[PDB]
Coordinates of C-alpha atoms (C1' of nucleotides) and ligand atoms in Angstrom, one line a residue:
Chain A
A1 CA -20.4 94.6 110.9
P2 CA -20.9 97.9 108.8
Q3 CA -21.9 97.3 105.2
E4 CA -19.1 97.5 102.7
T5 CA -21.1 100.3 101.0
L6 CA -20.5 102.7 103.9
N7 CA -16.7 103.3 103.6
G8 CA -15.7 100.5 101.3
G9 CA -14.1 103.0 98.9
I10 CA -11.9 104.2 101.7
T11 CA -11.1 100.8 103.1
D12 CA -10.3 99.5 99.6
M13 CA -8.0 102.5 99.0
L14 CA -6.2 101.9 102.3
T15 CA -5.7 98.2 101.7
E16 CA -4.2 98.7 98.2
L17 CA -1.8 101.2 99.7
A18 CA -1.0 98.6 102.3
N19 CA 0.0 96.1 99.7
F20 CA 2.3 98.5 97.9
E21 CA 4.1 99.4 101.1
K22 CA 4.6 95.8 101.9
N23 CA 5.4 94.4 98.4
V24 CA 7.1 97.3 96.6
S25 CA 8.4 99.8 99.1
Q26 CA 9.3 97.0 101.6
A27 CA 7.9 99.1 104.5
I28 CA 6.2 96.4 106.6
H29 CA 5.3 98.9 109.4
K30 CA 3.6 101.2 106.9
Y31 CA 1.8 98.1 105.6
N32 CA 0.4 97.4 109.0
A33 CA -0.5 101.1 109.7
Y34 CA -2.7 101.1 106.6
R35 CA -4.3 97.7 107.5
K36 CA -5.0 99.0 111.0
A37 CA -6.6 102.1 109.6
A38 CA -8.6 100.1 107.1
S39 CA -9.8 97.8 110.0
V40 CA -10.9 100.5 112.3
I41 CA -12.7 102.3 109.5
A42 CA -14.2 99.0 108.3
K43 CA -16.0 98.7 111.7
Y44 CA -17.0 102.4 111.9
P45 CA -20.9 102.3 111.7
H46 CA -21.2 105.6 109.8
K47 CA -20.5 106.9 106.4
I48 CA -17.3 109.1 106.8
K49 CA -17.8 112.7 105.7
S50 CA -14.3 113.9 106.1
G51 CA -10.7 113.2 107.1
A52 CA -11.0 115.0 110.4
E53 CA -13.9 112.8 111.3
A54 CA -11.8 109.8 110.4
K55 CA -8.8 111.1 112.3
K56 CA -10.7 110.6 115.6
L57 CA -10.4 106.9 115.1
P58 CA -7.3 105.2 116.6
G59 CA -4.8 104.3 113.9
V60 CA -5.9 107.1 111.6
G61 CA -3.5 110.0 111.5
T62 CA -2.8 113.2 109.6
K63 CA -1.6 111.6 106.4
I64 CA -4.5 109.2 106.0
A65 CA -7.1 111.9 107.0
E66 CA -5.6 113.9 104.2
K67 CA -5.9 111.0 101.8
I68 CA -9.5 110.5 102.8
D69 CA -10.3 114.1 102.0
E70 CA -8.8 113.7 98.5
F71 CA -10.8 110.5 97.9
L72 CA -14.1 112.0 99.1
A73 CA -13.6 115.0 96.8
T74 CA -12.3 113.2 93.7
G75 CA -13.3 109.6 94.1
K76 CA -9.7 108.6 93.8
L77 CA -6.1 109.1 94.9
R78 CA -3.5 110.4 92.5
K79 CA -0.6 108.5 94.1
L80 CA -2.7 105.3 94.0
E81 CA -3.8 105.9 90.4
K82 CA -0.2 106.4 89.3
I83 CA 1.3 103.3 91.1
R84 CA -1.5 101.1 89.6
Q85 CA -0.4 102.1 86.1
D86 CA 3.2 101.6 86.9
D87 CA 4.3 98.4 85.0
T88 CA 7.3 97.7 87.3
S89 CA 5.4 98.3 90.6
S90 CA 2.2 96.6 89.7
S91 CA 4.2 93.6 88.5
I92 CA 6.2 93.3 91.7
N93 CA 3.1 93.7 93.7
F94 CA 1.3 91.0 91.7
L95 CA 4.1 88.4 91.8
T96 CA 4.0 88.4 95.6
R97 CA 0.6 86.6 95.4
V98 CA 2.6 83.5 94.6
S99 CA 3.3 81.6 97.8
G100 CA 7.0 81.6 98.3
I101 CA 7.6 84.8 96.4
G102 CA 8.1 87.7 98.8
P103 CA 9.0 91.4 98.2
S104 CA 12.6 90.5 97.6
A105 CA 12.1 87.7 95.1
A106 CA 9.4 89.7 93.4
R107 CA 11.7 92.7 93.0
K108 CA 14.5 90.4 91.7
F109 CA 12.3 88.7 89.2
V110 CA 10.9 92.0 87.8
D111 CA 14.4 93.4 87.6
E112 CA 15.4 90.6 85.2
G113 CA 12.3 90.8 83.1
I114 CA 10.1 88.2 84.8
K115 CA 6.8 89.9 85.5
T116 CA 3.9 87.5 84.9
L117 CA 2.9 84.0 85.9
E118 CA 3.7 83.1 82.2
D119 CA 7.2 84.4 82.7
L120 CA 7.5 82.3 85.9
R121 CA 6.4 79.2 84.0
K122 CA 9.2 79.8 81.4
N123 CA 11.8 80.1 84.2
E124 CA 11.2 77.2 86.5
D125 CA 14.9 76.8 87.2
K126 CA 14.9 80.3 88.7
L127 CA 12.3 79.3 91.3
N128 CA 13.0 77.4 94.5
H129 CA 10.8 74.4 95.6
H130 CA 8.3 76.5 97.5
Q131 CA 7.8 79.0 94.7
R132 CA 7.2 76.3 92.1
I133 CA 4.4 74.8 94.2
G134 CA 3.0 78.3 94.9
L135 CA 3.0 78.7 91.1
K136 CA 1.5 75.3 90.4
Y137 CA -1.4 76.0 92.7
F138 CA -1.7 79.8 92.3
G139 CA -5.4 79.7 91.6
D140 CA -6.3 77.0 94.2
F141 CA -4.3 78.8 96.9
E142 CA -6.4 82.0 96.5
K143 CA -9.7 80.1 96.7
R144 CA -11.4 79.8 100.1
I145 CA -12.4 76.5 101.7
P146 CA -16.1 76.0 102.6
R147 CA -16.7 74.7 106.1
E148 CA -18.2 71.5 104.7
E149 CA -14.9 70.7 103.0
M150 CA -13.0 71.7 106.2
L151 CA -15.1 69.1 108.1
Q152 CA -14.3 66.5 105.5
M153 CA -10.6 67.4 105.7
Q154 CA -10.8 67.2 109.5
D155 CA -12.4 63.8 109.4
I156 CA -9.4 62.5 107.4
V157 CA -6.7 64.2 109.6
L158 CA -8.3 63.0 112.9
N159 CA -8.8 59.5 111.5
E160 CA -5.3 59.1 110.1
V161 CA -3.5 60.6 113.2
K162 CA -5.4 58.2 115.5
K163 CA -4.6 55.3 113.2
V164 CA -0.9 56.1 113.5
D165 CA -1.1 56.3 117.3
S166 CA -4.3 56.5 119.3
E167 CA -2.5 58.5 121.9
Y168 CA -1.8 61.5 119.6
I169 CA -4.0 64.6 120.2
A170 CA -4.9 66.7 117.2
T171 CA -6.8 70.0 117.1
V172 CA -7.8 71.9 114.0
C173 CA -7.6 75.6 115.0
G174 CA -7.9 78.9 113.1
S175 CA -11.2 80.5 112.4
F176 CA -12.6 77.1 111.6
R177 CA -12.5 76.2 115.3
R178 CA -14.3 79.5 116.0
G179 CA -17.1 78.3 113.6
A180 CA -16.2 80.1 110.4
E181 CA -18.3 79.5 107.3
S182 CA -15.1 79.3 105.2
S183 CA -11.4 79.1 105.8
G184 CA -8.2 80.2 103.9
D185 CA -6.3 77.0 105.0
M186 CA -6.1 74.3 107.6
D187 CA -4.1 74.7 110.7
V188 CA -3.5 71.6 112.7
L189 CA -1.9 71.4 116.2
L190 CA -0.5 68.0 117.2
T191 CA 0.9 66.7 120.5
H192 CA 1.7 63.4 122.2
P193 CA 2.1 62.4 125.9
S194 CA 5.6 61.2 125.0
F195 CA 6.6 64.8 124.1
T196 CA 7.1 67.4 126.7
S197 CA 9.3 70.6 127.0
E198 CA 12.0 68.5 128.6
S199 CA 11.6 65.0 127.0
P200 CA 12.2 62.9 116.5
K201 CA 9.7 61.2 114.2
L202 CA 6.4 62.0 115.9
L203 CA 5.6 64.6 113.3
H204 CA 7.1 62.6 110.4
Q205 CA 4.9 59.5 111.1
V206 CA 1.8 61.6 110.8
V207 CA 2.8 63.5 107.6
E208 CA 3.8 60.1 106.1
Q209 CA 0.5 58.5 106.8
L210 CA -1.4 61.5 105.4
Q211 CA 0.7 61.1 102.2
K212 CA 0.2 57.3 102.2
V213 CA -3.6 57.8 101.9
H214 CA -2.9 60.5 99.3
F215 CA -4.4 63.4 101.3
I216 CA -1.1 65.4 101.5
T217 CA 0.0 66.0 97.9
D218 CA 3.1 68.4 98.2
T219 CA 5.5 69.7 100.9
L220 CA 6.6 73.3 101.2
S221 CA 8.7 72.8 104.3
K222 CA 9.1 70.0 106.9
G223 CA 11.1 69.8 110.0
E224 CA 10.8 68.1 113.4
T225 CA 8.1 70.4 114.7
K226 CA 6.5 72.1 111.8
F227 CA 5.1 70.9 108.5
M228 CA 3.7 73.2 105.8
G229 CA 2.2 71.6 102.7
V230 CA -0.7 71.0 100.4
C231 CA -3.6 68.6 100.6
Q232 CA -6.6 67.6 98.5
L233 CA -9.9 65.9 99.3
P234 CA -10.6 62.7 97.2
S235 CA -12.6 63.4 94.1
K236 CA -16.1 61.9 93.8
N237 CA -17.4 59.7 91.0
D238 CA -17.3 61.6 87.8
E239 CA -17.3 64.7 90.1
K240 CA -14.9 67.6 89.4
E241 CA -11.8 67.2 91.6
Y242 CA -11.5 69.4 94.6
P243 CA -8.9 72.2 94.6
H244 CA -5.6 71.7 96.4
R245 CA -5.4 73.3 99.9
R246 CA -2.8 74.7 102.2
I247 CA -2.3 72.7 105.4
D248 CA 0.1 73.3 108.2
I249 CA 0.8 70.8 111.0
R250 CA 2.7 71.8 114.2
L251 CA 4.0 69.4 116.8
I252 CA 3.8 71.0 120.2
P253 CA 5.1 69.7 123.5
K254 CA 2.3 68.5 125.8
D255 CA 2.9 71.1 128.5
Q256 CA 2.6 73.9 126.0
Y257 CA -0.2 72.4 123.9
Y258 CA -3.2 74.3 125.1
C259 CA -1.5 77.6 125.2
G260 CA -0.9 76.8 121.5
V261 CA -4.5 75.9 120.7
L262 CA -5.8 79.1 122.4
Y263 CA -3.3 81.3 120.5
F264 CA -3.9 79.6 117.1
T265 CA -7.6 79.7 117.6
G266 CA -7.7 83.5 118.0
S267 CA -9.0 85.6 116.7
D268 CA -6.1 88.0 116.8
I269 CA -8.4 90.7 118.1
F270 CA -9.4 88.3 120.9
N271 CA -5.8 87.4 121.5
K272 CA -4.9 91.1 122.1
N273 CA -7.8 91.8 124.4
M274 CA -7.0 88.6 126.2
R275 CA -3.3 89.5 126.4
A276 CA -4.4 92.8 127.8
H277 CA -6.8 91.6 130.4
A278 CA -4.0 89.1 131.2
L279 CA -1.4 91.7 132.0
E280 CA -3.7 93.9 134.3
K281 CA -4.2 90.7 136.3
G282 CA -0.4 90.1 136.5
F283 CA 0.1 87.7 133.7
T284 CA 1.7 87.4 130.3
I285 CA 0.3 85.1 127.6
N286 CA 2.1 84.1 124.4
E287 CA 1.7 81.0 122.2
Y288 CA 3.9 78.9 124.4
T289 CA 3.0 79.6 128.0
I290 CA 1.3 81.8 130.6
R291 CA 3.7 83.3 133.1
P292 CA 3.2 85.4 136.3
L293 CA 4.8 88.8 136.1
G294 CA 6.7 89.4 139.4
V295 CA 6.8 92.5 141.7
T296 CA 9.8 94.0 139.9
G297 CA 8.9 92.3 136.7
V298 CA 10.7 88.9 137.0
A299 CA 8.3 86.5 135.1
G300 CA 8.5 83.4 137.2
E301 CA 8.4 79.9 135.6
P302 CA 5.6 79.1 133.2
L303 CA 2.4 77.9 134.9
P304 CA 0.9 74.4 134.4
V305 CA -1.8 74.2 131.8
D306 CA -3.9 71.1 131.0
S307 CA -6.6 72.8 129.1
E308 CA -7.7 76.1 127.6
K309 CA -9.9 76.8 130.6
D310 CA -6.8 76.4 132.9
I311 CA -5.5 79.6 131.2
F312 CA -8.8 81.5 131.6
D313 CA -8.8 80.6 135.3
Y314 CA -5.3 82.1 135.9
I315 CA -6.7 85.5 134.7
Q316 CA -10.1 85.3 136.4
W317 CA -12.0 85.0 133.1
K318 CA -15.0 82.9 132.4
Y319 CA -14.0 80.3 129.8
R320 CA -14.8 81.7 126.4
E321 CA -16.2 79.4 123.7
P322 CA -14.2 79.5 120.4
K323 CA -17.6 80.6 119.0
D324 CA -17.4 83.8 121.0
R325 CA -13.7 84.8 120.4
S326 CA -14.2 87.2 117.5
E327 CA -12.8 89.7 120.0
Chain B
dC1 C1' 12.2 113.8 118.2
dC2 C1' 12.4 109.2 117.4
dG3 C1' 11.9 104.1 118.6
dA4 C1' 8.3 100.3 118.5
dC5 C1' 5.4 98.2 115.6
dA6 C1' 6.3 89.8 117.6
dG7 C1' 8.9 85.9 117.7
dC8 C1' 10.4 82.0 115.4
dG9 C1' 10.7 77.3 112.1
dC10 C1' 12.4 76.0 108.0
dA11 C1' 14.9 76.8 103.4
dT12 C1' 18.4 79.0 101.5
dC13 C1' 21.7 82.5 101.1
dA14 C1' 26.3 84.8 102.5
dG15 C1' 30.6 84.1 104.1
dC16 C1' 34.4 81.8 106.6
Chain C
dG1 C1' 32.2 71.3 105.5
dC2 C1' 30.2 74.7 109.0
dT3 C1' 27.6 79.1 111.4
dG4 C1' 25.0 83.0 111.2
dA5 C1' 21.9 86.0 108.4
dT6 C1' 18.1 86.7 105.4
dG7 C1' 13.7 85.6 103.2
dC8 C1' 9.3 83.9 103.9
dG9 C1' 5.3 82.6 106.0
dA10 C1' 1.2 82.8 109.1
Chain D
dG1 C1' 2.1 106.0 109.0
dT2 C1' 0.6 106.3 113.8
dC3 C1' 1.4 106.3 118.3
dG4 C1' 3.4 107.7 122.6
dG5 C1' 7.6 108.0 126.0
Ligands
NA1 NA1 -6.3 109.1 115.1
NA2 NA1 4.0 85.5 98.3
NA3 NA1 1.3 87.1 99.3
NA4 NA1 -3.0 52.6 120.7

DNA sequence: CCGACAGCGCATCAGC
DNA sequence: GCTGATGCGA
DNA sequence: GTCGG
């Protein structure tokens, strides 16, 4: 990976613009265009000398090449400088860091004078359940989770799930499964032999047990197949308590389980390249199933999958260790 | 020139 | 009461 | 904003 020093000024500039498109202008596609440009530039192993040079990279077009030229010659971007100083826009952009507060809620809050966390604290009744929790753990939620804590967190989840019913199968995915040194949250996929695509408390019993042992502390949303909440490792003797963490738990039918583990294990880059290689071989792979694309294009029924490898086999690909799925 | 850029669970809104 | 749409997330 | 039919 190229050192941040190479084009960090440029990548930082593109990422800030991305946030403003997403959070203020509500232009999600522009948001992603910037992110895509920032990503391709972030992996470019050379210090960019001009916009034209950058334009050769996929995802970098005329407008961004133009912005790069301005930043190389001035060390900044007038539009970015201006929006940063804009009280309304910087406040809308900032409020979106609260989990539960999106571009719409952020805009509404700022419209009525609520611009800071302090304002949010004085207006609890104007926040829904999710937002109050995002506010309560604002700092904790932005902190990363060291792998050691992730292992401790896994120990608890795996233990409690098996305690509820030894037949449950639980897999912690995300970058953690790929061996990451830290994580932004914990993503748990859960299944049970009694639950197939064609077979109401399976998920509830697990969440309940996790709350019973005081691991899960709050709930953002909870249905029959998906749970999104907060957890916290138990504090040690006289030791500073651990920060609260975001944890999601999805209940997936057995026959769609491994397609789910693969997908949620990523990385996204790997998922694309795998979805690509998948198509050229006559297959389509999403998070639910792998299906054979017919002669005219009639995707027959989903193929049977009993493991990640099963999927790799259908596309003539040597099973890839989560460790080697960065792309 | 102009459409795609992912699809979907849950919470909550808009409206009958 | 309900259905469908919208906001939000990851 | 960028790509591509
Ligand atoms: Na380009
Ligand atoms: Na947010
Ligand atoms: Na956010
Ligand atoms: Na048992």
